[PDB]
């Protein structure tokens, strides 16, 4: 035992360098990349995403490739979510995502619920060589170049804690209550 009865011995070559970055978005709608371009192996990334309210039936993972602050200018790879528990606003705002990169070029992303031991794994692969260098060449430059546009969304994110600095005058307006007695038994 512990010696593999079924060992997978196969020949293959990878791209060496990761095309683009990979990650999810957190509170404020800002992307946070775990794995970055030009970094494939050996490395393993894991991050806990926490937003205001996820209200998910477990954990949600939107697998998009690229790098930006805006999630709109990236390229979707796929989607998978773990639905095992009733969608709750509180209790499940922690998206636990761990990317286990296999030396064979297999992206094994493991997601786990915080309420119960519900784990979900999916094999993300880019095995099919069909990614022209022009794709990554333009994106590596444009995504960075358009970070100037990312600054505009970062603005409203920074405005969150800035608005938090706004102190209100009163707590609540005291409404006029009517206290009289009309004898009508």
From Swiss-Prot:
Induction: By heat shock. It is found in: Cytoplasm; Nucleus; Cytoplasm, Cytoskeleton, Microtubule organizing center, Centrosome; Secreted. The modification N6,N6,N6-trimethyllysine is found at residue 182. The modification Omega-N-methylarginine is found at residue 90. Residues 15-130 are annotated as: Substrate-binding domain (SBD). Signal peptide: none annotated. The modification N6,N6-dimethyllysine is found at residue 182. Acetylation enhances its chaperone activity and also determines whether it will function as a chaperone for protein refolding or degradation by controlling its binding to co-chaperones HOPX and STUB1. The acetylated form and the non-acetylated form bind to HOPX and STUB1 respectively. Acetylation also protects cells against various types of cellular stress. It is linked to In certain aggressive cases of activated B cell-like diffuse large B-cell lymphoma (ABC-DLBCL), plays a role in the cytoplasmic sequestration of misfolded N-terminal mutated PRDM1 proteins, promotes their association with SYNV1/HRD1 and degradation through the SYNV1-proteasome pathway. HSPA1A inhibition restores PRDM1 nuclear localization and transcriptional activity in lymphoma cell lines and suppresses growth in xenografts. Molecular chaperone implicated in a wide variety of cellular processes, including protection of the proteome from stress, folding and transport of newly synthesized polypeptides, activation of proteolysis of misfolded proteins and the formation and dissociation of protein complexes. Plays a pivotal role in the protein quality control system, ensuring the correct folding of proteins, the re-folding of misfolded proteins and controlling the targeting of proteins for subsequent degradation. This is achieved through cycles of ATP binding, ATP hydrolysis and ADP release, mediated by co-chaperones. The N-terminal nucleotide binding domain (NBD) (also known as the ATPase domain) is responsible for binding and hydrolyzing ATP. The C-terminal substrate-binding domain (SBD) (also known as peptide-binding domain) binds to the client/substrate proteins. The two domains are allosterically coupled so that, when ATP is bound to the NBD, the SBD binds relatively weakly to clients. When ADP is bound in the NBD, a conformational change enhances the affinity of the SBD for client proteins. Component of the CatSper complex. Identified in a IGF2BP1-dependent mRNP granule complex containing untranslated mRNAs. Interacts with CHCHD3, DNAJC7, IRAK1BP1, PPP5C and TSC2. Interacts with TERT; the interaction occurs in the absence of the RNA component, TERC, and dissociates once the TERT complex has formed. Interacts with TRIM5 (via B30.2/SPRY domain). Interacts with METTL21A. Interacts with DNAAF2. Interacts with PRKN. Interacts with FOXP3. Interacts with NOD2; the interaction enhances NOD2 stability. Interacts with DNAJC9 (via J domain). Belongs to the heat shock protein 70 family. This is Heat shock 70 kDa protein 1A. It comes from Homo sapiens (Human). The lineage of its organism: Eukaryota, Metazoa, Chordata, Craniata, Vertebrata.
């Amino acid at each position: 035992h512990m010696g593999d009865k079924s060992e997978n011995v196969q020949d293959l070559l990878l791209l060496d360098v990761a095309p683009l970055s990979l990650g999810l978005e957190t509170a404020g709608g800002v992307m946070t990349a775990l794995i970055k371009r030009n970094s494939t192996i050996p490395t393993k990334q894991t991050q806990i995403f926490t937003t205001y309210s996820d209200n998910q039936p477990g954990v949600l993972i939107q697998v998009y490739e690229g790098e930006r602050a805006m999630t709109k200018d990236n390229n979707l790879l796929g989607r998978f979510e773990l639905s095992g528990i009733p969608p709750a606003p509180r209790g499940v705002p922690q998206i636990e995502v761990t990317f286990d990169i296999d030396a064979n070029g297999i992206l094994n992303v493991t997601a786990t619920d915080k309420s119960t031991g519900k784990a979900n794994k999916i094999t993300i692969t880019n095995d099919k060589g069909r990614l022209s260098k022009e794709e990554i060449e333009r994106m590596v430059q444009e995504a960075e170049k358009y970070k100037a546009e990312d600054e505009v969304q970062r603005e409203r994110v920074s405005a969150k804690n800035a608005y938090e600095s706004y102190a209100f005058n009163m707590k609540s307006a005291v409404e006029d209550e009517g206290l009289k007695g009309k004898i009508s038994e």
